[PDB]
Amino acid sequence: MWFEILPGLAIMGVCLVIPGVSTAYIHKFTNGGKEKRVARVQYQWYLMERDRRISGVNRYYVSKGLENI
């Protein structure tokens, strides 16, 4: 019957969710458990570069808070 279309429609569904879920997690796995920093304008790019320089390990996502002063 018509529900015999579902086996292929369900495969196609699982396939279309792997892109979004895998990218979201890979970004967290490569950015210290945080969303990949977006830099639309030069100001935001400056903040990342400053964060990269003060981290101490040359990675912008290793944040330093009040522990560091």
Partner 1 sequence: MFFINILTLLVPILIAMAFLTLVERKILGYMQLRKGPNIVGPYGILQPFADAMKLFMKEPMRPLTTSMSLFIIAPTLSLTLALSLWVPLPMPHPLINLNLGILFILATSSLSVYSILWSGWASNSKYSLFGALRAVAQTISYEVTMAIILLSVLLMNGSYSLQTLITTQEHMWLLLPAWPMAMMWFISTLAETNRAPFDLTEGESELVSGFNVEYAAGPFALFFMAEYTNIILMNALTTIIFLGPLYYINLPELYSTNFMMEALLLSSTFLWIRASYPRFRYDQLMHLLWKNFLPLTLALCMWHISLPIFTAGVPPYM
Interface with ligand 3PE by CB under 6 A: which residues? Answer: 2, 5, 9, 39
Q: b/e string for 13-29 if b means 16 or more Cβ within 10 A?
A: eeeeeeeeeeeeeeeee
Give residues 7-36 in contact with partner 1 (rule: CB under 8 A). 7-9, 11-13, 15-24, 26-27, 29-30, 35-36
Stretch binding partner 1 (CB under 8 A), from 5-13, 45-53, 54-62? 5-13
Residue type, 46: Y
Q: Which is nearer to ligand CDL, 11 or 26 (CB)?
A: 11
Distance CA 25, CA 29 (A): 6
